[PDB]
Paper text:
GmPOPB-S577A (the higher resolution of the pair) bound to the full-length substrate (35mer) belongs to space group P21 with four monomers in the asymmetric unit. In all 35mer and 25mer complexes, the enzyme adopts the same “closed” conformation in which the lid (the propeller domain) sits on top of the catalytic domain. In both 25mer complexes the N-terminal residues of the substrate (IWGIGCN) are disordered; in the S577A–35mer complex the N-terminal two residues (MF) are missing, while in the H698A complex only the first N-terminal residue is absent. There are no large differences between the protein backbone positions in the complexes with the 35mer and 25mer substrates (root mean square deviation (rmsd) of 0.48 Å over 720 Cα positions for the S577A structures). Substrate P10, the site of proteolytic cleavage, is positioned for attack by Ser577 (the Cβ of the mutated residue is 3.3 Å from the carbonyl with plausible geometry). Tyr496 is on the opposite face of the carbonyl 2.8 Å from the oxygen and positioned to stabilize the tetrahedral intermediate from attack of Ser577. In the 35mer complex structures, residues 2–9 adopt a helical arrangement that ends up exposed to solvent at the N-terminus and makes few contacts with the protein. In the 35mer complex, the core and linker adopt a tightly packed arrangement that is wedged between the active site loops. We propose the arrangement of and interactions between C-terminal 25 residues and protein that are seen in the 35mer complex act as a kinetic trap, which can only be escaped by dissociation.
GmPOPB is the macrocyclase responsible for macrocyclization of amatoxins, eight amino-acid ribosomal peptides with the core sequence IWGIGC(N/D)P. Amatoxins are cyclic peptides further modified by a characteristic sulfoxide cross-link between tryptophan and a cysteine, and hydroxylation (the extent of which vary). GmPOPB is an unusual enzyme catalyzing, depending on substrate length, proteolysis, or macrocyclization using the same catalytic machinery. The protein contains two domains as observed in other POP enzymes. The domain containing the putative catalytic residues (Ser577, Asp661, His698) comprises residues 1–81 and 450–728, and the other domain is a seven bladed β-propeller, comprising residues 82–449.
Numbering used by the authors:
A (entry chain E): 3 to 13, 15 to 35
B (entry chain A): 4 to 225, 228 to 727
């Protein structure tokens, strides 16, 4: 998590390709 | 204005030479004639313009790109939504996208009750926070956010185009941000402005008075490197000058920090990371009436770098922790802080052949666990006594995640896969047994039918004998008879798993052309835990490439795909994978190659921006023993004059701060110099909008970039539209 934000990777919630563009589904998982 | 063999822009070659030490050879002088492409100058601008114009003229010859753009736009034009969250005001909050919006909008329920979402998002909720209006011209993005525990405040991190850091703002939850609110009055946020935020999340204290966050030193305009991180605390309703420094370490300026707070208000946790490996320190402080302050007393529970430790929850002084200590597939331990020497014990033991990926505490005493077996997620509920009670969604095939708040009587699961667009499941503890599990919402797509596509898992053998699984996806009318084209994706590093995911663009392409999609679970990833990662890193990094090449060879040999019709694609470390693979694999193994924002100079990666942290993954070029295994693998240093390369389209964004575009510039100049007469085009497309930290591109631009990449692949493999 903290440490993954600085990998050489495309974008959180493990977006390892360009086609991961749609992150809406998981975007509500940790907001409170 | 027109591509043909040998018609590339002239690229100056300098006489720069760097000297390295090799353990087996002594001094090695290494020419770097394209060192000047590291820089930002008029000459570099001319060169990038000429390359980008050559690439665009080639794409303009291909009339199928415009048709793909229309197909792809339609395939993404469907409503999308997140799981909802219940705050202490009694209302439910979720993200909603109408279909093609660049940022999704945060909605709030009209009534304090779980909505019946079949009635439509606008009929059951109103806009609370629309990130698209953060700036009038759309140049500002919300990168992440967090409501306070009491539900009264909303903190949010904002980046702007051109910027290297984010800024946190705070607003009352009864003060929405919409088109109407901006037209009618003041912003409605507090004057709080927390700058220099990066590589962090927002962690509220359970009293809701403030939050912890990581920041860097303030820097004037007149270089690009993030050091001397500080974990800080910001009290709501004050300015940043009053923020408290919770921890920093001047003796180790490269280390960074994370934090957590316990639900009962008793504990503050501090994490320390020295690099991109999965090893961290863990210290614990007891909070009291004085709250967060300077001079916090830290108990140094884990004080050497040896394993991954992440807090789940606690009951009194018993702390539950997910770890890989002596357990490369992960497990759950307890640490009892009531003893002077903490007593450490297994709570849920390690599974030898399945990775423990996620654990949350739910309804105060239960545990929800996700295991990843054969790269497929499985969900289980456990009691407080550690007894596995039941499996949830036993027929689901894909990737899963949990969304909950410990104190509440429900949780959600978000589920997706190669033909599962996005299902949100609810578990309600207060309902009768046998009626607790239900489906809240299912994502409906456009034009596409997910049932028309078959997804399977097959096994192949690598060079050293190792058995490796690979996902294969096809439209059901496509035969495995040695005639289809294949698109093969990979990442290959940092213990990141190449999990299943839903893409409407990929499935649209498969149906349009009768092609297949392949995802091999190559070493360097974390699919099979820490030993899988260790199998493809530092001195074993070569195995990552061997595994990827063997996958492509298997697709042709066993008739999944036609000879010469395997294309490869990947981003960042995935770009390194693609660039190294075309250099190493036999002539004609691949029919096209698209590396996006990739690493390629493995001798100099550690000299730029945050690259030093990746020494954990690649090794250190300045250590003689490690130079000996890096140098033969660095794509920039291993291009030859005597091998035909496949059609290649390199893509980079000029503002990329994580992977400097230098890497791709040097690789493409070296390709064009070494094989100027290559019968297939070797091109680079360069986007010149300078993206801010953590920001994406607009949707319309993403649709067009996708049409260009996939259309280029189609033409190179000789595929026509029917």
């Amino acid at each position: 998590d903290t440490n993954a934000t600085r990998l050489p990777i495309w974008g959180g919630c493990n977006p390892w390709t360009a086609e991961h563009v749609d992150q809406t589904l998981a975007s509500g998982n940790d907001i409170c | 204005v027109t591509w043909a063999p040998g018609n590339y822009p002239s690229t100056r070659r300098s006489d720069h030479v760097d000297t390295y030490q090799s353990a087996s050879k002594g001094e090695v002088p290494v020419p770097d004639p394209y060192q000047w492409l590291e820089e930002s100058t008029d000459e570099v601008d001319k060169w990038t313009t000429a390359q980008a114009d050559l690439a665009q003229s080639y794409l303009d010859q291909n009339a199928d790109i415009q048709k793909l753009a229309e197909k792809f736009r339609a395939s993404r034009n469907y409503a999308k939504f997140s799981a909802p969250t219940l705050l202490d005001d009694g209302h439910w909050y979720w993200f909603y996208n109408r279909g093609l919006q660049s940022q999704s909008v945060l909605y709030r329920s009209k009534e304090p009750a779980l909505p019946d979402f079949s009635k439509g998002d606008d009929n059951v909720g109103d806009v609370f926070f629309d990130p698209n209006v953060l700036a009038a011209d759309g140049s500002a993005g919300m990168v992440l956010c967090k409501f306070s525990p009491d539900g009264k405040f909303f903190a949010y991190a904002v980046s702007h185009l051109g910027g290297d850091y984010s800024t946190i703002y705070v607003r009352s939850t009864s003060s929405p941000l919409s088109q109407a609110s901006v037209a009618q009055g003041v912003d409605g946020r507090l004057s709080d402005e927390v700058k220099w935020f990066k590589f962090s999340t927002i962690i509220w204290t359970k009293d809701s008075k403030g939050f912890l966050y990581q920041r860097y030193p303030a820097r004037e305009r007149h270089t690009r490197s993030d050091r001397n991180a500080m974990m800080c605390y910001h009290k709501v309703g004050t300015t940043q000058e009053e923020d408290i420094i919770v921890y920093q370490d001047n003796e180790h300026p490269e280390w960074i920090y994370g934090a957590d707070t316990s639900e009962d208000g008793k504990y503050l946790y501090l994490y320390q990371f020295k690099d991109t490996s999965k090893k961290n320190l863990l210290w614990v402080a007891e909070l009291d009436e004085d709250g967060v302050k300077s001079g916090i007393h830290w108990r140094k529970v884990v004080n050497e770098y040896a394993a991954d430790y992440n807090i789940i929850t606690n009951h009194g002084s018993l702390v539950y922790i997910k770890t890989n200590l002596n357990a490369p597939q992960y497990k759950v331990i307890t640490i009892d802080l009531s003893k002077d020497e903490p007593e450490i014990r297994d709570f849920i033991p390690e599974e030898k052949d399945a990775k423990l990926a996620q654990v949350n505490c739910a309804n105060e005493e239960y545990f929800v666990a996700i295991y990843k077996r054969n790269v497929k997620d499985e969900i289980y509920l456990y009691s407080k006594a550690g007894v596995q009670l039941t499996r949830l969604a036993p027929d689901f095939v894909g990737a899963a995640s949990i969304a909950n708040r410990q104190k509440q009587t429900h949780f959600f699961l978000t589920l997706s896969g190669f033909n599962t667009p996005g299902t949100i499941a609810r578990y309600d503890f207060t309902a009768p047994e046998t009626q607790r599990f239900s489906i809240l919402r299912t994502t409906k797509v456009n034009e596409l039918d997910p049932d028309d596509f078959e997804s399977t898992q097959v096994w192949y053998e690598s060079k050293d004998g190792t058995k490796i699984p690979m996902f294969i996806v096809r439209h059901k009318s496509t035969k495995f008879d040695g005639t289809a084209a294949a698109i093969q994706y990979g990442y290959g590093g940092f213990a990141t798993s190449a999990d299943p995911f839903f893409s409407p663009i990929i499935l649209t392409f498969l149906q349009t052309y009768g092609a297949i999609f392949a995802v091999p679970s190559i070493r360097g990833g974390g699919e099979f835990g820490e030993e899988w990662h260790k199998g493809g890193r530092r001195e074993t990094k070569v195995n990552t490439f061997d595994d990827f090449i063997a996958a492509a060879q298997f697709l042709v040999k066993n008739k999944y795909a036609a000879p010469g019709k395997v294309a490869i694609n990947g981003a960042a470390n995935g770009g390194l994978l693609v660039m190294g693979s075309i250099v190493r694999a036999p002539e004609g193994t691949f029919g096209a190659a698209v590396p996006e924002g990739g690493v390629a100079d493995l001798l100099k990666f550690h000299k730029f921006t945050g690259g030093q942290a990746w020494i954990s993954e690649y090794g250190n070029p300045s250590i003689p023993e490690e130079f000996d295994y890096i140098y033969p693998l660095s794509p920039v240093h291993n291009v030859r004059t005597d091998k035909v390369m496949p059609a290649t389209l390199i893509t980079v964004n000029i503002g990329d701060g994580r992977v400097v575009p230098m890497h791709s510039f040097k690789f493409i100049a070296t390709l064009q110099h070494n094989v100027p007469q290559n019968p297939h085009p070797l091109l680079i497309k360069i986007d010149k909008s300078w993206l801010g930290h953590g920001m994406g591109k607009p949707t319309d631009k993403n649709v067009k970039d996708a049409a260009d990449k996939w259309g280029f692949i189609a033409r190179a493999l000789g595929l026509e539209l029917k």
